[PDB]
Amino acid sequence: KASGTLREYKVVGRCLPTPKCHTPPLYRMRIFAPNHVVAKSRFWYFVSQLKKMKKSSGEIVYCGQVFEKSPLRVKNFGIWLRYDSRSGTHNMYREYRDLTTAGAVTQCYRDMGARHRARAHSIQIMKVEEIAASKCRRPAVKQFHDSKIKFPLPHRVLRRQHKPRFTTKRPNTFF
Amino acid sequence: SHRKFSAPRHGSLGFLPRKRSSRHRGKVKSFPKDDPSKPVHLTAFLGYKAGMTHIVREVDRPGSKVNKKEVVEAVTIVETPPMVVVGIVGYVETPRGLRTFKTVFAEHISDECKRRFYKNWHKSKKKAFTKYCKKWQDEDGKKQLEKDFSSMKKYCQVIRVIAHTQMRLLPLRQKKAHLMEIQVNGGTVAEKLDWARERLEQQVPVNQVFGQDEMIDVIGVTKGKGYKGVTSRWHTKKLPRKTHRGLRKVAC
Amino acid sequence: MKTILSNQTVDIPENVDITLKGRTVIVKGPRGTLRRDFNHINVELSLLGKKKKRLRVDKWWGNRKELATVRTICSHVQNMIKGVTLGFRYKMRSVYAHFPINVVIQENGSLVEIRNFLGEKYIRRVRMRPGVACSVSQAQKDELILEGNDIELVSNSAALIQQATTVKNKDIRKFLDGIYVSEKGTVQQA
Amino acid sequence: SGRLWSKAIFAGYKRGLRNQREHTALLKIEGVYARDETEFYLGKRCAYVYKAKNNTVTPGGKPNKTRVIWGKVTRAHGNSGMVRAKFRSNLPAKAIGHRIRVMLYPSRI
Amino acid sequence: VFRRFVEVGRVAYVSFGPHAGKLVAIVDVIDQNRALVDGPCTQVRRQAMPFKCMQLTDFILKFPHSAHQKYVRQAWQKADINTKWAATRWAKKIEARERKAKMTDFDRFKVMKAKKMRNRIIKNEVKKLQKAALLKASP
Amino acid sequence: EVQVLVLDGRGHLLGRLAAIVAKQVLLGRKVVVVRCEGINISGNFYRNKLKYLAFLRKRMNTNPSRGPYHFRAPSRIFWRTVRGMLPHKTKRGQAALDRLKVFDGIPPPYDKKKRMVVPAALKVVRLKPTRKFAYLGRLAHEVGWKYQAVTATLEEKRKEKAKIHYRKKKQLMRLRKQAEKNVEKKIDKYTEVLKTHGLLV
RNA sequence: AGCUACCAUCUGUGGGAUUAUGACUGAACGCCUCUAAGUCAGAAUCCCGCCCAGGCGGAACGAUACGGCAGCGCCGCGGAGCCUCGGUUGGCCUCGGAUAGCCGGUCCCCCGCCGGGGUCCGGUGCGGAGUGCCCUUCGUCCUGGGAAACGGGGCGCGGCCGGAGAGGCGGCCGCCCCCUCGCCCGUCACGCACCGCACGUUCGUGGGGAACCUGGCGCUAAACCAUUCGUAGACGACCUGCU
RNA sequence: CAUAGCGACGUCGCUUUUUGAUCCUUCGAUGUCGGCUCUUCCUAUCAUUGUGAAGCAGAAUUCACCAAGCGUUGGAUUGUU
RNA sequence: GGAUGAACCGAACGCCGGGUUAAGGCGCCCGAUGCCGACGCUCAUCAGACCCCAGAAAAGGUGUUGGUUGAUAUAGACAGCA
């Protein structure tokens, strides 16, 4: 599974009806995939791991994107997950600040890849939930709980380094 | 494989270009470090190897077996007729190194000195420095000379004097004088420039530069041996008598 | 993790003033003037009031390593204040088993000569850092008094003296001779 | 009266690492260092002007040493304002790093 | 040292990106890199925005963080940011750059003539002042 | 471009500036670099000194005279660095390599002219402030370059004369601003024209 | 004599950054701590000096070709022309520097009337801005209003100063001769207007080589071979001498 | 008294200076041991310069680090390595 | 294309023009990121830099970054001093 800007998907599926149970139970999952096809594939993988289901043995009845109910509000996300490291499987709890749940999941993917070399295929996201500022446990997130937050931009790096490529004046980084 | 026993290397790698010297005189390549604190003094001189002999003296070295005893030590005779300073060169420091800024030659260059400029003195018209010396008389020429002196004063870092020997005082066949740049040390640039100007056309006896019982450095070109084999050129080991294609060689 | 802001404020006494030229700290006290710049650390320095002279050291968006620099700067500033107000006097005691250590305090206390360290014929010539005055204590038989304004210079001179009398090729645990710093103290005891 | 053409540099031929397509060439128009700014110069006539030993006929003038290899810029190249030019004859390799004029002849503005 | 800070109500100028050349007000701070950004009167709907495309100004509004569009818009209109900004040297420098860029050939010709005459007069006055200042001789 | 491009080496990184120069000389452009001793190299000084000593160790064991010519002058070092980014074994590379001139300090042909600065190679913007860096002048001085002191003295004299020139130019600019103040009733007609089209805010 | 031997005799050198290590201040971690920032000492190692050679690398200076028509140098952008090599298509004539800060101006202290300091006032997404500045070419003729008129032009002469890191450059006076022309807005018409077409527009009197004429100002030499030497040497080369 | 100096039981590496395994090159030929001579290189450092530790009192010795600049010899026996 | 390589990756071939790509790339060599690329980690006095592939293991680090589990704490922790 590659990445991009992930999207939440409410995936609903069930087994094929059989002459043992005419109405098999439905199962609903939240899957974060770059596209709905990958969402369906991951849904089949997860239901095969948890229940005794196969993609051929069952069917998917609904697959739609889950839009963020308040993308204009800053909120704290608590994420539970497990991943296979180079020497086994471990459980983690991470915290992020983002407007969208899917963006928070993408941030979690990028952070895990950056810190633990965890490729996307090795990561099992098991719980995503918005949390209050009081329930946050990571100080890197808790330090943004300031009603009077204030900080400058200390050392601004020049980004337009090639327009011009040659000039007479040395740039100023103080602003 | 390793050689079975270690041995010090034959000869020195500090003299690798084992070639005939490109010069017959022997240049200084490093003058003593100058300080303005010392009085004005020359740093070099020219001499001719007259010969060798031995002397008898008493040694005043306490703690030695030869203390207050008589010793016989070989000495070398170097005839040194007084040098004649005939010019001044001023050098300026550059990031590319020292370079010749300006050169001033004195009037009335000695006849033996003028012989150096000619490969064939016999066939020469003896025209060397004839038009140059005329600028020591006209007022415009002396103004030019004073301007050169002022430029050397305000720009040059180290100055050196051109001095020549005196063949007519020596029993050699050669009448061609030996020219040399000699560094003038010990003072400010203006002081040494004036001091050199007061010594133009003059004689500098060897006593004014070097003193009694002081230790100096000798620069020269060794005796020529012609084409020599490794046995004499490097003092390598001679191969045994049984060797077929030669015993005065390097085996490997 | 980059901490948003880490700051510590150092109070300045009324008898001494501090002037800032960017990150160069000029401290002028009754004992003299000490100047030290911190151009190698990218922090913010500011003077707070005209009443009590609070100095604050600010570092914005710092990782774990550079956060340690704030208190280092604060301690250096306090050391400069202590030096310009009270000064730094280091007391070194010379110890020996058989050969007494003869110490000659040469001109203005800038040069210290050791004669009979372990009885060897060598003489140790140690030059003090500028602004540091060394002297022989008049209250003790074997004590060297080093006085100066800058703590680094005084302690560096003391370390030079201590390392100058170093036993070699011997079991230093048994041969304990040398000059060693007894205490690090102040002048004027205020 | 005026320069009346833009300065450009024959940077080189269209090429891979070990293959060289000499039938088309890459040019560097001075002051154009982005791909979006290359639209104005697409389709413009471009000429390579040089001198030689023998006199050649000059349209509207006396014969002289000036020789021209005509061409026109086809499409943008890269993202740093590079452009591609197809000439009537393949450019001689001695012109690499020399002046190429953009003649503004096909005006679309 | 620092005179301009990132805080709620701070007015920032957009350097590049989709909303370049617009004034916005910071609403909240996100992960050291982004911020809740709102221009209610400069036609910039609420959205996240990286700090790298921001250039801070000296206008600071006074509204609670994460407030709705209404209060931010009232804080913008009261003590009008637009009129005060337009009087600043920054905004008029931007305007001068924009009108210089859109100057036509005729405008270039007129500007060249006017600058010719202006520079000639200024240089004449400079020469007059030099010669007036050259008559100095005092022990 | 057609003119000679003068680049000041102070505060510039070695690799970035060398790559930019090598790209410039390939375009048929004349490049002159002054004050090459002011070039900074990323990484602490000891590591770069070890790198240059390792370069010194690489020599032809059979005949060091034919071996790699280790140049010790900072300008020569930068010249060799640029030569590493060019096909200097070809005629095109040599022709490009002849368009580059490098100097320690600023020579009299160039001290009376303005000097460009490349933003993409400056140490201030291409290096994190917490890092350490190595001066090319100091590194050359401790490895075999011989003329650091005389270069510093000549740069000191050039700075003195440049300060005199700067004070003269400040006097001229002050007098120009004064002249602008003296005459505006005969200037405002054109001033409004210039202010209308963006020039002269 | 010459050559020659620890088989005789003489001579063999200075400095820098630093490794290991030992320390200082000092947090990180209200204690400590050689380390994180910043500092000190430090060696048969390393590098440089001394020494040896001297780049398809440079410097300064010398003298630069006859007594006959004979060569050469400079001055004239002097002329008429040839051959050859092609690039290019306005200039910017300069602070130092910092980036957790800069830049400008001004009132008081101190150094030769100009600078360094302490105040105060401004600018800072740099506008006293290289995203910048200067100049800008159609030309002439009536023809007014402004700018100026203490103004520009002199390949015009003479004088002076500054520039030495590669000064190959720049600046300032005196005399003489010009026009009141050139700069903006206006008036007035004219020019080959070559009938749609490309290499046009500059550096430029470009670089280099032979040659003619036209004038002025100046000069009259070396190298090599041969020979001689032996401080040299396979031969060359090298050190010498020759009314 | 584990670790001054060693290290059983186990266990992980490095070298191509030994000897093995293979037969990829060489069978219209790459002269095969050893010795002599000579140059350079490596360090897993014997000594020397500078250090740290010891069951380092001194001496002597051992262990360890920076370290390959300098040196590592004369002989009886054996063709010898 | 992998610098280079009988086997690897892509892709198999009459001679050309235009266009688009694969594998792989886009500081300069050397065509292309001269994107105002996004997020984080990392200082190495033998750093690191791309299948095959051309160099490394066990064991450690109070260097730094996350994460798990547990414990103490205004009924005053922890660390210092007594």
Ligand SMILES: COC(=O)C[C@](O)(CCCC(C)(C)O)C(=O)O[C@@H]1C(OC)=C[C@]23CCCN2CCc2cc4c(cc2[C@H]13)OCO4
């Ligand atoms: C019986 O002993 C030999 O084989 C040595 C010799 O005969 C030496 C002859 C050399 C001449 C000049 C006569 O060709 C010979 O043919 O050398 C061969 C030789 O011919 C040149 C080839 C070898 C193969 C590769 C190198 N050459 C190296 C010498 C050698 C040494 C040997 C060997 C074979 C080779 C060969 O077996 C054991 O030790």
Ligand SMILES: [Mg+2]
């Ligand atoms: Mg050996």
Ligand SMILES: [Mg+2]
């Ligand atoms: Mg035989």
Ligand SMILES: [Mg+2]
């Ligand atoms: Mg002997």
Ligand SMILES: [Mg+2]
């Ligand atoms: Mg303390």
Ligand SMILES: [Mg+2]
């Ligand atoms: Mg250390």
Ligand SMILES: [Mg+2]
């Ligand atoms: Mg030191």
Ligand SMILES: [Mg+2]
């Ligand atoms: Mg054979």
Ligand SMILES: [Mg+2]
């Ligand atoms: Mg053979």
Ligand SMILES: [Mg+2]
């Ligand atoms: Mg080792």
Ligand SMILES: [Mg+2]
């Ligand atoms: Mg002992």
Ligand SMILES: [Mg+2]
């Ligand atoms: Mg050696």
Ligand SMILES: [Mg+2]
């Ligand atoms: Mg291939």
Ligand SMILES: [Mg+2]
């Ligand atoms: Mg490869």
Ligand SMILES: [Mg+2]
């Ligand atoms: Mg094709």
Ligand SMILES: [Mg+2]
């Ligand atoms: Mg490549």
